[PDB]
Design a binder for this molecule. Structure first.
Ligand SMILES: *[C@@H]1O[C@H](CO)[C@@H](O)[C@H](O)[C@H]1NC(C)=O
Ligand SMILES: *[C@@H]1O[C@H](CO)[C@@H](O)[C@H](O)[C@H]1NC(C)=O
Ligand SMILES: *[C@@H]1O[C@H](CO)[C@@H](O)[C@H](O)[C@H]1NC(C)=O
Ligand SMILES: *[C@@H]1O[C@H](CO)[C@@H](O)[C@H](O)[C@H]1NC(C)=O
Ligand SMILES: *[C@@H]1O[C@H](CO)[C@@H](O)[C@H](O)[C@H]1NC(C)=O
Ligand SMILES: *[C@@H]1O[C@H](CO)[C@@H](O)[C@H](O)[C@H]1NC(C)=O
Ligand SMILES: *[C@@H]1O[C@H](CO)[C@@H](O)[C@H](O)[C@H]1NC(C)=O
Ligand SMILES: *[C@@H]1O[C@H](CO)[C@@H](O)[C@H](O)[C@H]1NC(C)=O
Ligand SMILES: *[C@@H]1O[C@H](CO)[C@@H](O)[C@H](O)[C@H]1NC(C)=O
Lengths: 334, 338, 338, 338, 338
């Protein structure tokens, strides 16, 4: 009867088609073509060095036992109820740089299945996976991270299974936009890694690598320019006469207090890393600059016991060195 | 006859039913009518750019096999446990991050069947959807939170979603939001996803969220404005009463920078500018300029006292005016838009 | 006659009992009497506007084709395993966020049968229900947290839930809420939801939670008052000790701003203003007022010291008076509601 | 003789065994002997008033349907796989917020059968149990946190729990908690819940937990003491040092407020007074009295400076004595007679 | 010759295999040679005293019943879905707080079968094992974390665990932690849990972790050191300008208190003393002592100004050397030990 005899004579206990036995058993390997689609991307929580992707994975391969004779002569493709994706052979795939993953089952198991006449099978499964990409935060606001995703096999060695990408358009995505970063859909380098685990053998692994560039907008708006204006205020205090010299001290204190609070905030907001970051570099720089303004006030105080001359040399040296530092710092961490 | 033998003869192992296919296989597609009833609405957080909803989704469609003639009734109610034995159209929300059914005393579902085969399948679902939020004008924004419906294993040639003509989307009476104002202008549309595998059908509904600014008013704007209006008093004071003016300016700057740091770090991380940040920066700068003005007065008054008093009165009569004009432009450019 | 064959002839493979078919099919509805036991209550986070309960829902109903005459004992208890093989009514909680069962060493559920046909089904549950708050008077509020039981897939024409007459809602003896206090009076009612499908039954209990002012008082109010008095101290100091009063006022302002910001941000984001906001803002105003009084006496003086000390002592002897008047006014306008 | 055939005869399909039928049906109840072995103990969070435990629960009970002579081994080890075929008694933890199994490489269970039928059933669980706390004396508190094993479906007329005689509750050699120190004297008893459906059997094991003061001591009391010593140095100062004395007093007050905020913030929200709060507020009042004493001497100054220095010396010699009295009273009433 | 009939004859339905029976029933015990491949390592948290790993656990043993003489290939890999019919040994982790598998596109597993009968079962796991840390020297600590592969339901008389001779525990090339320095000296020890039921095997692997103090140094130590040098330069000011020293001392001490509060917040509560706590407290103490010395200077100086300047110079010239000797002792005694 219509199409159920098809599905059954093709794959079920009624027909001799074993889901547990790969195709071409004891022959060539299985070439599992692949191509991804990324629907959502984000939740980059540097506190854990991870990112979350909600994607429509897709993979096709060959299985001569699933050939459609003239019994179906209406189209070159065929779509079945996803509930039978668990009845035919599947490639044992997983993600190695993975922390926690899950399917998406809402109103059905979000699975897609296509079968052609040549045996070419295709299967897709929506997935929301929380991968990990170790961050190199030496250049914090200008970090050019390379966050990766290496699809591996498991259970099947390279002598039976073998992954390969799709020639054209392997990783799609539509109107992407993030709050912090700015993906380079062109700088999407991908390639082979081909893990080798001792005791078992060679396992195949193909990896995508997205180049994530961080926007310096938020930091340039929230910390850098504020601290710059603070250190600029610090210089205005020099103009005040040393006779009164009762508010220059709290002015230098503002140059230390505010900066320490900013450092503490931005530190407790970011992960814990030994290697120093450009952010902390600039922070301690402005910190020591305010500190130097204050200790120069202290000196002129002890110099008062010709002090104005010291203030002159200060107005001459402070901005020059600060601006040389800013120049070299931007030229280094641009 | 008997309900047991009835539901066996119908969509049961005794019947010729095959739930692994769609109606009229190798024929025209289905015209599925969808409609959702909302119950709750919250968790709207700019940090994750998400929003939570618990909805009683409903799909009506046609399945010619289920048409029966044993009972005089036109519409019939069945047991959810039979749902798993009939066809169901694959459906997902392409803009979801976490979604779940609800299992309490049962699998919460509903399955009505009309004599003409018209099936009605309703399912309760809790959804943490995603919404790309544009915060160009944060405290007073008009967001465009979306909800998409679309198949995943059935293409347009076989499945076609469609909204319901009348009352496709409802909202439960008495529903209120913490700091948002849901609008009754829920605009529908088709997204018609086009992938490298087929032409998937689609539906989308766009809500319009009108944020409330009472919290930001009584927590940021009013304190900043009061701090600035306080700092202004320093100008009216004589240049001799230094401690008064210096204390006013210094405490004003300190509290203003505290408010700035707080209300700036309590927000998500975005490159583009924000109205609240503009306002915080401008008030910080007003009080900063008051302090720098006292400094310039001290410098001038090493006659000089005349210039000092002249600048004092100029500031006292201008800075309020500067804040007035800036506030006018600010409100009249960030409110007229909505 | 072994009990295996008994359960088989009752509800097992035999007996023609199809759990899919509710009793009185095409007949009157199934009048369910559902009562509750509350074992725990807490996690009432104002920010999430929800509350967690661990309850023992125990609903009974009088269906047919479960009676018998084999065991003369009126009551009877079975293995919870067969509970899934019979008809269990379809109900949910229409104001739940996240709900689950509790399976430890066995699925925690009870089934009891009688000789007349009655049935009792008691399934432990944990529910993170939702409750809307009106925090206009936050530290002194009486919230009406509601729990709604309703059906899904069975209309009021086929399944209605009516509470139990005597002792429907119960609570454990040694129950203790940390923040709030729970009343012995619950409000039972019918909400009788009406969707676009038909008429769905519903039943709601309202718990009255009355907040304790203890923690909020000992944490915000008392330190705020002590800091305000620290500020007031500035009026007793000698006018010549300008730096002392300056540092004092500045420290008072900064610490009050920090305390206010913390206490306010710990709460959720809402437009309607709260009493705690009023208190923190007026204490901020009073600290600023002491600072501004110092500034204005400086502006006055620099025999003017006479007028300076006059205004200073007037402040020192009046400001506490206005603070106390405002305190009694505030408490009589915010606390009398209880 | 084969093991597979033997198991099939014993409890498998071919056996004739029934699971839903407890042993001694329509007869005397069961006498279960329950013990446990604790492995991980911690996550004692006063916020949620809960604590986590990982336990190798063990239940022994005799069902005369499992008695053989083929395998002469007195005991016998089975596979957890078919465990679900035998009658494992219902059970739960009435004081659990969220419980979990452990499924890693196999189901964590142990089914040891004797020659007569004395089944032993081991199960590894993790439990986020709840124990209400009385923090009237918080840092020196002796908390009693309970675990209640209690049946749910089967009543005391068919199922009776009761502890083991020798070593009913055990612990892992080398168990130490961060804050507390678990006592070796656990209390054992019955609770015997009696709901309206019937009399349900129950158990209760109470662990006593003594809180080590070390952290709160090296973090709050020692600071507060140093701050009071600084305030006494301030007492021992001349009168014309307004800025210095005021700075010292305000430093003391502000650091005291910070420590008090920390203490009251590392805890849940409650309605009564905590001991740490008593001490912190007492030291705060001490330093505030120091500041007010300075203010009084400055008001008295402007012979009068003679009596001013007299009261200064009086305060210097008194307030240390008052603080000693408070310290002694406090410590003897909390840490000695309680 | 056929593969499917071969599998069904070997370890499927038609086979005489029973998946619930170890080989050599009531015979000698099977000795499983376990091994590990750590793919990542992190989420170490001193708050809950645990870490996290994702590993390709493997265990291989011998069962004659899987001998096949048809396929000449020595080894052979099978579909993970066959494990449900093979005897996989019971195995749990004792220090585990929470574990899970990872089933994405298939339930990640691996079954390999040699010709003589040797079997290899590998599985991917993710585990939040527990590592009780002794924080006597927190920033410079050497924490010894454990992983206990233990058995459940199989005594040491029937199931024994043993490591693999060569390279049992492996690691990934790019395996790096954010704030730790893992060592390649992984200790392999026997654990041999001895419960009341019997002697259960247990195999422990110990990782020696060394924390790197870059973050703590640049975030707490360095700011505190700067604030202390600030409290030092407070001395080089003139006495007559008391506002300077007042403001500087207050600004330093308040920041020090807040930073100590942040430090304690970043750590848990614990009885014994933490190094960073010692250092933070002693820096707060030096700030206290510097402000106290300023106060005593003002006391002695209303000759007197002579002695005031003398003591202030002695302080400004020696206090740094005291800080230096303390710091050298501190680092030399808390660095060379860890
Ligand atoms: C992927 O790269 C590895 C690198 O050694 C190679 O061995 C393997 O054949 C490649 N896969 C292909 C060509 O499909
Ligand atoms: C569904 O809609 C399409 C296009 O509007 C139409 O061609 C088709 O005939 C409709 N299906 C039915 C049941 O007529
Ligand atoms: C369903 O089929 C009926 C014919 O009985 C038709 O009138 C109706 O328009 C169809 N509607 C849908 C949604 O399929
Ligand atoms: C159920 O109660 C309703 C009243 O609400 C009554 O009309 C109906 O007859 C009752 N049916 C049964 C079976 O008790
Ligand atoms: C209980 O059973 C009696 C008789 O079987 C019936 O009249 C009644 O409607 C049932 N329901 C209730 C709630 O009593
Ligand atoms: C169970 O114990 C009770 C008392 O503890 C006893 O009366 C009863 O006979 C026992 N039943 C058994 C051992 O079957
Ligand atoms: C359980 O089994 C029998 C009673 O049927 C007896 O030998 C044994 O002592 C019983 N244990 C109890 C009652 O604890
Ligand atoms: C495991 O080791 C024991 C050593 O006592 C040995 O008797 C036994 O044969 C070993 N296992 C196997 C399968 O040989
Ligand atoms: C299993 O037994 C075989 C002998 O048949 C032995 O060679 C092998 O080492 C054993 N496996 C172990 C010890 O893991």
């Amino acid at each position: 009867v219509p199409a159920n005899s098809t599905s059954n004579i093709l794959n079920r206990l009624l027909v001799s088609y074993d889901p547990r036995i790969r195709p071409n058993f004891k022959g060539i390997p299985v070439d599992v073509v692949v191509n991804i689609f990324i629907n959502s991307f984000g939740s980059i929580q540097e506190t854990t060095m991870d990112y979350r992707v909600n994607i429509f994975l897709r993979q096709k391969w060959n299985d001569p036992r699933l050939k459609l004779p003239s019994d179906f002569r209406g189209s070159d493709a065929l779509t079945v109820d996803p509930t039978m994706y668990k009845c035919l052979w599947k490639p044992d795939l997983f993600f190695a740089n993975e922390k926690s993953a899950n399917f998406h089952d809402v109103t059905q198991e979000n699975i897609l299945l296509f079968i052609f006449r040549d045996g070419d099978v295709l299967v897709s499964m929506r997935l929301s996976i929380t991968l990990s990409c170790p961050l190199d935060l030496t250049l914090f606001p200008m970090d050019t991270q390379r966050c990766k995703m290496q699809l591996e096999s498991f259970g099947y060695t390279t002598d039976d299974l073998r992954f390969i990408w799709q020639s054209g358009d392997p990783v799609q995505l539509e109107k992407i936009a993030l709050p912090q970063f700015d993906i380079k859909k062109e700088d999407i380098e991908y390639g082979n890694c081909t893990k080798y685990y001792k005791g078992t053998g060679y396992y195949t692994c193909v990896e995508v690598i997205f180049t994530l560039r961080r926007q310096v907008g938020f930091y340039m708006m929230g910390v850098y320019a504020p601290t710059l204006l603070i250190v600029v205020l610090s210089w205005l205090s020099f103009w005040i006469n040393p006779d009164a010299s009762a508010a220059r001290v709290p002015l230098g204190i503002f140059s230390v207090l505010s900066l320490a609070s900013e450092c503490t905030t931005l530190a407790a907001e970011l992960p814990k890393v030994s290697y120093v970051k450009a952010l902390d570099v600039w922070l301690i720089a402005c910190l020591l600059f305010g500190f130097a303004s204050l200790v120069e006030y202290a000196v002129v105080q002890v110099m008062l016991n010709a002090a104005k001359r010291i203030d002159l040399y200060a107005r001459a040296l402070f901005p020059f060195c600060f601006l040389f530092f800013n120049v070299i710092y931007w030229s280094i961490y641009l | 006859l008997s309900p047991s033998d009835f539901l066996d003869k119908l969509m049961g192992r005794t019947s010729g039913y095959d739930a692994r296919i769609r109606p009229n296989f190798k024929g025209p597609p289905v015209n599925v009518t969808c409609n959702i009833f909302i119950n709750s609405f919250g968790s709207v957080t700019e940090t994750t750019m998400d929003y939570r909803v618990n909805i009683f989704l409903r799909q009506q469609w046609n399945d010619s096999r289920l048409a029966y003639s044993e009972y005089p009734d036109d519409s019939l109610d069945l047991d959810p446990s039979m749902l798993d034995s009939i066809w169901k159209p694959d459906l997902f929300f392409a803009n979801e991050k976490g979604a779940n059914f609800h299992d309490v005393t049962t699998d919460n579902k509903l399955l009505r069947i009309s004599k003409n085969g018209k099936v009605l399948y309703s399912i309760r679902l809790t959804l943490t959807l995603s919404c790309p939020m544009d915060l160009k004008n944060f405290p007073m924004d008009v967001q465009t939170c979306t909800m998409q419906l679309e198949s995943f294993g059935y293409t347009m040639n076989d499945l076609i979603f469609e909204w319901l003509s009348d009352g496709p989307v409802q909202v439960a009476e008495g529903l209120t939001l913490p700091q948002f104002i849901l609008k009754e202008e829920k605009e529908l549309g088709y997204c018609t996803k086009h992938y490298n595998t087929g032409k998937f059908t689609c539906i989308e509904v766009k809500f319009h969220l009108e944020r409330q600014m009472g919290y930001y008013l009584i927590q940021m704007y009013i304190p900043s404005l009061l701090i600035v209006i306080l700092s202004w008093v320093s100008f009216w004071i004589n240049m001799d009463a230094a401690p008064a003016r210096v204390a006013l300016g210094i405490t004003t700057v300190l509290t203003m920078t505290t408010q700035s740091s707080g209300s700036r770090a309590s927000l998500p991380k975005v490159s583009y500018v924000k109205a609240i940040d503009i306002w915080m920066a401008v008030c910080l700068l007003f009080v900063f300029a008051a302090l720098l003005e006292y400094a310039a007065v001290n410098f001038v008054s090493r006659k000089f006292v005349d210039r000092a008093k002249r600048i004092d009165t100029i500031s006292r009569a201008a800075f309020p005016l500067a804040f007035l004009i800036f506030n006018i432009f600010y409100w009249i450019t960030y409110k007229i838009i909505r």
